[PDB]
Motif scaffolding. Structure first.
Motif, mmCIF file in Angstrom:
data_model
loop_
_atom_site.group_PDB
_atom_site.id
_atom_site.type_symbol
_atom_site.label_atom_id
_atom_site.label_comp_id
_atom_site.label_asym_id
_atom_site.label_seq_id
_atom_site.Cartn_x
_atom_site.Cartn_y
_atom_site.Cartn_z
ATOM 1 N N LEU A 80 74.698 53.038 87.151
ATOM 2 C CA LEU A 80 73.863 54.049 87.652
ATOM 3 C C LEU A 80 74.514 55.542 87.655
ATOM 4 O O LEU A 80 75.432 55.923 88.652
ATOM 5 C CB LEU A 80 73.688 53.659 89.400
ATOM 6 N N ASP A 81 74.179 56.227 86.588
ATOM 7 C CA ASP A 81 74.815 57.488 86.463
ATOM 8 C C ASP A 81 73.881 58.536 87.189
ATOM 9 O O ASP A 81 72.816 58.486 87.198
ATOM 10 C CB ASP A 81 74.801 57.825 85.079
ATOM 11 N N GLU A 82 74.716 59.611 87.407
ATOM 12 C CA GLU A 82 74.102 60.884 88.339
ATOM 13 C C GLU A 82 73.644 60.177 89.642
ATOM 14 O O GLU A 82 72.398 60.157 90.105
ATOM 15 C CB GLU A 82 73.328 61.644 87.607
ATOM 16 N N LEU A 83 74.584 59.423 90.415
ATOM 17 C CA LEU A 83 74.284 58.639 91.719
ATOM 18 C C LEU A 83 73.708 59.492 92.775
ATOM 19 O O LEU A 83 72.740 59.117 93.408
ATOM 20 C CB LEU A 83 75.503 57.770 91.982
ATOM 21 N N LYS B 262 84.052 60.181 82.491
ATOM 22 C CA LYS B 262 83.573 59.181 83.551
ATOM 23 C C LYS B 262 82.531 58.061 82.602
ATOM 24 O O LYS B 262 82.817 56.982 82.513
ATOM 25 C CB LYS B 262 82.819 59.669 84.559
ATOM 26 N N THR B 263 81.642 58.843 82.133
ATOM 27 C CA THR B 263 80.454 57.973 81.056
ATOM 28 C C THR B 263 81.134 57.525 79.944
ATOM 29 O O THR B 263 80.689 56.196 79.559
ATOM 30 C CB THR B 263 79.424 59.022 81.045
ATOM 31 N N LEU B 264 81.864 58.117 79.333
ATOM 32 C CA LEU B 264 82.621 57.589 78.117
ATOM 33 C C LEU B 264 83.509 56.476 78.415
ATOM 34 O O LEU B 264 83.441 55.444 77.597
ATOM 35 C CB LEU B 264 83.482 58.901 77.612
HETATM 36 MG MG MG Z 1 78.286 61.501 82.767
#
Ligand code: MG
Ligand code: ATP
Ligand code: ATP
Ligand code: MG
Lengths: 106, 439, 483
Positions: free
Chosen positions: C188-191, C108-110
């Motif tokens: 907004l990561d780790e929402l 996801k983050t990548l």
């Molecule tokens: Mg992540």
DNA sequence: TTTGAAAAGCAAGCATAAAAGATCTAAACATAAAATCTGTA
């Protein structure tokens, strides 16, 4: 030997080398000369004295310090608690059981 | 190990263990050491004897019972360690740290690190013994507190010239048995037997007794002989009250202090060389322990009625208190059939309503066309009842934020039977007649 | 003055209190914020540096382990959707929310970072206008309101407290005209970590995307697709929207391609290995390195069965390479200072230690007293079926098992040790020797649960582990299964 | 003086109210560093 007997007892009860070390340290430290240290490691009688001291304040050892009146009150409370359904008791029931045993003995 | 073992009577094993564990060399000293024994087992006494016999050891003495909570204990550790290090080495310039900055265990680690790093000019490594005499006597104790103290040494620097060593005293076995897998070295202090208790009492009290003012005024009103008098008094006190006190040094000391002047006042010229004649002269001192130190009429009768309402079942009340003439055909209660097996006054009281208490109060209170001699519940009765709840002679189901006017709130007596017996004897009410027929 | 308590370790930041709405006299008084030297981003690294006094021996498997570290072959449709939404909303100067959810390690983050990198490359070619990229991770915040402190500090360069930062961001997104602004893309990561009880932060971040002058792209990365339905209100769920992008766990072929892409230049390649030290050089012996396609395939199939998590597949391959390198370094004695293959055996051993359970072999290696405790506990569960047994009943049943099998050889040798510690001067004890020790040992191991009670007899004890693995460990013992 | 029989009491069973307290939170009470207002020099 006595050392192997104590090591075997630790193996079957504690299986802990720090537990054995805590007993071996005052065996070495209380020795005054080399002959006393060799006698102490051959007999391991200080390990028995240590083991007796480590159990001196448990339920068995605390019972033997009680006076006769303390033992009588404890026995009366125990038999009242055994007769109870939930094991509960108070001071009044234990005292009533205690006076019943004193007049039954006298 | 180069250390002195003092001669402490009946504690030779414990003193040898203290010589085995407590030394000035940090390499052969445990980081934690536990002394465990119940009250009056001579733990403090023999630790005092050991450290006075070895004055080169550096001990810091703390009392957790004077500190109550964990945060004052941390602040006391920082304050006393810093003051002891200040008086130990006065030629070492130190930056003073405020002990009130310690609010967390981590803050204690940081503060001890900062205190210990200004002493690296010392030549030899040195133990600083911090003694927590009565760790489990701390009033706000929980199970997680002791783990921080036994793991505290792992966060301090390892190559420091000052190495803190913890010595704890514990009272109870179960608290110690919570932490048995940590394998901390422990020295146990079993309770003394009666011969050791008598010997300790003689060797601690005969000197103060034989130079007491009452004996020295009695011998001019009427040293080894005085020693035998005081020792025979101590032995008589032990044989009279050992069953009452158990093996308690403090309780027997209090009994000796209470009974010594009354024993001295019975000493005559005939009694000094005859201990038997002196014992029969003061027999009443050795027969009872003697360790001991205005309510309204409405309040007294309300307490009596509340005791009755608590300890008598309400189904039978009409079979005791009903005395009116029945114009209308009606059958009174038959009364209880079988007696109880257990005296109900031995148990906790039962709960009742207000109108039942007022009914029994009206039935038992002392006393024609326009008289109506029964006392009705006016405001003085309710005021007395409110005061009786204020004094906790009566109590309710709820203790705080009490709705007095709630019908759900029920009331119980809160006095024992001897108190209500003396109260009933003050107003000549026969309360024992109300419980004689029921068990 | 004499204080009732003291706060002697107060550490307060140098953060101002006045919000951005009082920074200029009027809305027309606001200058162009892009032509401002502190807006939109217009020292500790050298303390972890030293001088190297040796020469590290990198063996032939060290390059494999280095290339298998976590520091886009299977995400084309997700990349295209996120990139198209962000490109359309940036180039037309609008505000939008993109929602991304998935299990851990599914890229996801990548993928979002790659999308942002490609958008920055396109904005460097003057094909879309410039934007500022802000990354807010909710698990990297001490307090959840610190995101307000972070985002505003990324926008203006000021340092305010969180409430003033929130008012500043509200005034900025609502009132500042688009000609004086730059577009902001916020990840907004780790929402789920920024979800609080009042949900004001979630409402504000997703409500600023509904303002006409905002020029704000919020890419919210979550862990579940139903987070707005489960934890959020209807108002925030309406603002997040119906379109949500699911990152499915990888199938085994895509994990196979990921592992081959990390080892495209290393696999089936030759190295010059120095037999004096072990140091290998990628193009003295010429050694070919090989990792099996069957090994990678079985690791990828296992991982895709479990989670489809690329971190797990890379870690399993790295563990297999580590096991093979440990055996190689042991057999050659190299140190640290013709064909080397990492085989399916190493892959299976990497897959087995994560699936092995130590609980049974922990219980089979305990002392006789702890095993006797567990055996009596299981006996009491068989007798009454309560699943919670009082400790006094365990004491009585241990005593019963000692006095019933008294003619057994091992029991008649153990009884003096258990009740007197082999000493005539020690009285017969109500508990066995090491009773407290094995009770506390089983509590610290997590095998046992004990209620918080002060009466030692009526205190209940429960198995925390499964009953049949305890029975298997009890039947492993020679003495206990014979009585 | 009897009668007998309807009211009173006993007791097992069981649903249910309530006591006790574990766990927790709001609110009153309390302190404090940085920022911001405020009346002069
Ligand atoms: Mg992540
Ligand atoms: N072995 C002894 N020889 C002489 N006097 C003793 C001995 N043991 C105890 N005493 C006397 O009894 C007193 C009480 O003992 P002490 O204060 O050491 O008990 P403790 O176990 O530390 O008690 P606590 O837990 O209540 O603090 C001592 O102050 C001393 O006067
Ligand atoms: N398609 C891919 N190609 C190559 N490597 C990948 C791919 N997907 C994931 N990885 C690897 O796995 C790592 C984990 O990916 P990422 O950080 O994006 O996961 P995530 O979905 O955000 O997980 P989490 O929820 O735990 O944060 C990446 O850093 C990378 O090393
Ligand atoms: Mg003491």
């Amino acid at each position: 030997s006595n050392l192997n007997r104590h090591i075997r007892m630790n193996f079957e009860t504690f299986r802990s080398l720090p537990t054995l070390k805590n007993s071996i340290i005052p065996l070495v430290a209380t020795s005054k000369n080399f002959g006393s240290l060799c006698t102490a490691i051959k007999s391991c009688s200080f390990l028995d004295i240590y083991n007796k001291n480590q159990l001196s304040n448990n339920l068995t050892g605390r019972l033997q310090s009680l006076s006769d009146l303390e033992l009588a009150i404890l026995i009366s409370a125990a038999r009242v608690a055994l007769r109870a359904k939930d094991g509960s008791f108070n001071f009044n029931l234990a005292y009533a059981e205690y006076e019943k045993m004193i007049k039954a003995i006298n | 190990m180069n250390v002195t073992t003092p001669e402490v009577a009946f504690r030779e094993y414990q003193t040898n263990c203290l010589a085995s564990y407590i030394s000035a060399d940090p390499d052969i000293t445990p980081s934690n050491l536990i002394l465990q024994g119940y009250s009056g087992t001579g733990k403090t006494y023999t630790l005092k004897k050991y450290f006075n016999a070895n004055p080169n050891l550096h001990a810091v003495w703390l009392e957790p019972v004077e500190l109550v909570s964990w945060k004052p204990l941390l602040q006391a550790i920082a304050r006393t360690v810093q003051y002891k290090l200040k008086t130990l080495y006065p030629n070492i310039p130190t930056t003073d740290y405020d002990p009130l900055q310690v609010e967390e265990p981590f803050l204690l680690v940081k503060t001890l690190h900062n205190i210990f790093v200004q002493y690296e000019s010392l030549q030899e490594k040195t133990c600083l013994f911090l003694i927590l005499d009565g760790f489990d006597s701390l009033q706000d104790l929980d199970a997680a507190l002791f783990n921080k103290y036994i793991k505290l040494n792992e966060l301090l620097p390892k190559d420091s010239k000052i190495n803190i060593k913890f010595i704890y005293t514990m009272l109870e076995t179960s608290f110690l048995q919570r932490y048995s897998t940590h394998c901390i070295p422990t020295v146990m202090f079993p309770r003394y037997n009666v011969d050791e208790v008598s010997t300790i009492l003689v060797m601690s009290r005969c000197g103060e007794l034989m130079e007491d003012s009452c004996l020295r005024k009695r011998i001019i009103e009427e040293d080894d002989q005085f020693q035998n008098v005081a020792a025979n008094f101590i032995h008589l006190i032990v044989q009279a009250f050992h069953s009452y006190t158990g093996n308690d040094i403090f309780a027997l000391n209090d009994l000796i202090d209470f009974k010594w002047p009354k024993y001295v006042s019975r000493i005559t010229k005939e009694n000094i060389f005859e201990p038997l004649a002196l014992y029969k002269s003061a027999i009443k001192l050795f027969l009872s322990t003697d360790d001991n130190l205005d309510l309204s009429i409405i309040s007294k009768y309300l307490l009596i009625a509340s005791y009755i309402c608590s300890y008598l079942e309400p189904r039978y009340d009409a079979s005791i208190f009903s005395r009116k003439t029945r114009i209308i055909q009606g059958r009174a209660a038959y009364g209880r059939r079988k007696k109880k097996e257990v005296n109900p006054r031995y148990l906790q009281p039962s709960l009742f309503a207000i109108e039942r208490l007022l009914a029994i109060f009206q039935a038992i209170f002392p006393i024609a066309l326009r008289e109506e001699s029964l006392m009705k519940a006016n405001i003085e009765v309710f005021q007395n009842l409110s005061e009786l709840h204020t004094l906790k002679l009566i109590a309710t189901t709820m203790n705080k934020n009490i709705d007095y006017l709630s019908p759900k709130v029920r009331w119980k007596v809160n006095v024992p039977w001897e108190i209500i017996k003396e109260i009933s004897e003050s107003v000549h009410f026969n309360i024992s007649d109300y419980f004689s027929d029921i068990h | 003055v004499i204080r009732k308590f003291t706060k002697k370790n107060v550490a307060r930041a140098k953060k101002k209190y006045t919000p951005f709405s009082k920074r200029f006299k009027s809305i027309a008084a606001i200058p162009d914020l892009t032509s401002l030297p502190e807006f939109y981003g217009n020292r500790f690294e050298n303390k972890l540096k030293t001088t190297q006094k040796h020469q590290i021996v990198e063996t032939i498997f060290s390059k494999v382990k280095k290339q298998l570290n976590s520091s886009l072959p299977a995400r084309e449709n997700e990349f295209a959707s996120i990139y198209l939404s962000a490109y359309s909303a940036i180039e037309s100067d609008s505000a939008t929310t993109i929602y991304v959810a998935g299990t851990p390690g599914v890229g996801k983050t990548l993928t979002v970072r790659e999308v942002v990198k490609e958008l920055l490359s396109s904005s460097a070619q003057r094909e879309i206008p410039d934007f500022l990229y802000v990354e807010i991770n909710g698990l990297k915040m001490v307090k959840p309101t610190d995101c307000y402190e972070t985002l505003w500090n990324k926008v203006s360069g000021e340092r305010l407290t969180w409430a003033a930062s929130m008012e500043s961001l509200e005034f900025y997104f609502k009132r500042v005209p688009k000609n004086k602004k730059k577009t902001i893309v916020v990840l907004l990561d780790e929402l789920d970590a920024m979800v609080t009880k009042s949900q004001d932060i979630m409402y504000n971040f997703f409500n600023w995307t509904t303002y006409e002058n905002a020029k704000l792209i919020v890419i919210a990365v979550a862990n579940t697709m139903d987070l707005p339905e489960r934890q959020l209100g209807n108002k925030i769920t309406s603002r997040i929207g119906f379109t949500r992008i699911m990152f499915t766990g990888y199938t085994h072929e895509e994990l196979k391609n990921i592992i081959d892409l990390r080892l495209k230049g290393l696999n089936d390649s030759f190295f010059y290995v120095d037999t004096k030290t072990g140091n290998a050089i990628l193009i003295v012996r010429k050694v070919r390195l090989r990792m099996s396609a069957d090994a990678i395939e079985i690791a990828s199939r296992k991982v895709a069965s479990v989670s489809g998590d690329a971190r797990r597949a890379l870690k399993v391959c790295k563990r297999a390479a580590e096991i093979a390198e440990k055996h190689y370094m042991a057999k050659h004695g190299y140190g640290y200072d013709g064909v080397q293959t990492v085989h399916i055996t190493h892959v299976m051993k990497a897959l087995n230690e994560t699936l092995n359970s130590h609980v049974i072999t922990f219980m089979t290696r305990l002392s006789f007293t702890a095993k006797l405790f567990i055996y009596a506990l299981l006996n009491l569960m068989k007798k009454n079926g309560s699943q919670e047994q009082e400790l006094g009943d365990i004491v009585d049943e241990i005593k019963l098992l000692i006095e019933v099998n008294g003619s057994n050889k091992f029991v008649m040798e153990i009884a003096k040790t258990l009740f007197q510690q082999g000493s005539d001067n020690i009285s017969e004890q109500l508990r066995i020797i090491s009773w407290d020790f094995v009770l506390n040992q089983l509590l610290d191991a997590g095998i046992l649960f004990k209620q918080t009670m002060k009466n030692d007899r009526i205190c209940c004890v429960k198995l925390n582990i499964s009953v049949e693995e305890a029975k298997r460990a009890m039947n492993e013992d020679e003495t206990l299964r014979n009585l």
